[PDB]
Design an enzyme around this catalytic site. Structure first.
Site, PDB file in Angstrom:
ATOM      1  N   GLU A  35       0.834  -1.212   0.000  1.00 25.81           N
ATOM      2  CA  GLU A  35       0.000   0.000   0.000  1.00 25.81           C
ATOM      3  C   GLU A  35       0.870   1.264   0.000  1.00 25.81           C
ATOM      4  OE1 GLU A  35      -2.948   0.133  -0.605  1.00 25.81           O
ATOM      5  OE2 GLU A  35      -3.897  -1.772  -0.052  1.00 25.81           O
ATOM      6  N   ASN A  46      -7.941   8.695  -5.768  1.00 29.33           N
ATOM      7  CA  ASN A  46      -8.777   7.685  -6.443  1.00 29.33           C
ATOM      8  C   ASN A  46      -9.518   8.396  -7.570  1.00 29.33           C
ATOM      9  OD1 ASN A  46      -9.071   6.415  -3.136  1.00 29.33           O
ATOM     10  ND2 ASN A  46      -7.768   5.612  -4.769  1.00 29.33           N
ATOM     11  N   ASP A  48     -12.584   8.403  -8.216  1.00 35.44           N
ATOM     12  CA  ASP A  48     -13.897   8.862  -7.692  1.00 35.44           C
ATOM     13  C   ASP A  48     -13.746  10.152  -6.878  1.00 35.44           C
ATOM     14  OD1 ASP A  48     -12.918   7.948  -5.168  1.00 35.44           O
ATOM     15  OD2 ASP A  48     -14.656   6.690  -4.780  1.00 35.44           O
ATOM     16  N   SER A  50     -12.019  10.403  -4.023  1.00 34.11           N
ATOM     17  CA  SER A  50     -11.590  10.063  -2.647  1.00 34.11           C
ATOM     18  C   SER A  50     -10.053  10.002  -2.682  1.00 34.11           C
ATOM     19  CB  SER A  50     -12.169   8.761  -2.113  1.00 34.11           C
ATOM     20  OG  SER A  50     -11.717   7.671  -2.904  1.00 34.11           O
ATOM     21  N   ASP A  52      -6.620   8.055  -0.535  1.00 34.00           N
ATOM     22  CA  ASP A  52      -6.065   7.035   0.393  1.00 34.00           C
ATOM     23  C   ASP A  52      -4.888   7.653   1.150  1.00 34.00           C
ATOM     24  OD1 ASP A  52      -7.844   5.262  -0.774  1.00 34.00           O
ATOM     25  OD2 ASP A  52      -6.362   4.279  -1.964  1.00 34.00           O
ATOM     26  N   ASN A  59      -9.052   4.998   3.061  1.00 35.17           N
ATOM     27  CA  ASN A  59      -9.782   5.791   2.052  1.00 35.17           C
ATOM     28  C   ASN A  59     -10.766   6.759   2.726  1.00 35.17           C
ATOM     29  OD1 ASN A  59     -11.768   6.405   0.053  1.00 35.17           O
ATOM     30  ND2 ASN A  59     -11.309   4.539  -1.093  1.00 35.17           N
ATOM     31  N   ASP A 101     -15.126  -5.048   9.361  1.00 32.74           N
ATOM     32  CA  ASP A 101     -16.333  -4.543   8.636  1.00 32.74           C
ATOM     33  C   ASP A 101     -17.037  -5.679   7.879  1.00 32.74           C
ATOM     34  OD1 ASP A 101     -17.937  -2.047   7.842  1.00 32.74           O
ATOM     35  OD2 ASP A 101     -17.366  -2.826   5.868  1.00 32.74           O
TER      36      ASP A 101
END
Ligand code: NA
Length: 129
Positions: A35, A46, A48, A50, A52, A59, A101
């Site tokens: 990562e 990202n 979209d 967003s 990280d 995110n 999650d």
């Protein structure tokens, strides 16, 4: 901060990530390697809109607030900047919520694609833990 491999393994163990939700320490070190290359200041935008953040590339869509991700949540109740600290406490606490999650470490696409199923113990081999 750019951690060493064993230095990050020890920090993650200190913060209770070793075997958290059944994921051995090598899994966490492997995910951090791909990562962020162990860099707490890593950021990636990202498609979209967003972003990280940090060693585990958490995110803004769901987990932290950066003020610039429309419609997003802040389920770790932190500014995304906290995820860039030399102190990994915010990243670890938030990663514990993420891996709880429902999809385990599959939440980290780089873990699924590069760590899952591999000899992840190699990532802590030689380390004093
Ligand atoms: Na957010």
């Amino acid at each position: 901060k750019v951690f060493g491999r064993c230095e990050l393994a020890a920090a993650m163990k200190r913060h209770g990530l070793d075997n958290y939700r059944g994921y051995s320490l090598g899994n966490w070190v492997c995910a951090a390697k791909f990562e962020s290359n162990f860099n707490t200041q890593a950021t990636n935008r990202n498609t979209d809109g967003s972003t990280d953040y940090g060693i585990l590339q958490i995110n803004s869509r769901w987990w932290c607030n950066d003020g610039r991700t429309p419609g997003s949540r802040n389920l770790c109740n932190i500014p995304c900047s906290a995820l860039l600290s030399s102190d990994i406490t915010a990243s670890v606490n938030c990663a514990k919520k993420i891996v709880s999650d429902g999809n385990g470490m599959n939440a980290w696409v780089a873990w699924r694609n590069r760590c899952k199923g591999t000899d992840v113990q190699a990532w802590i081999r030689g380390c004093r833990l």
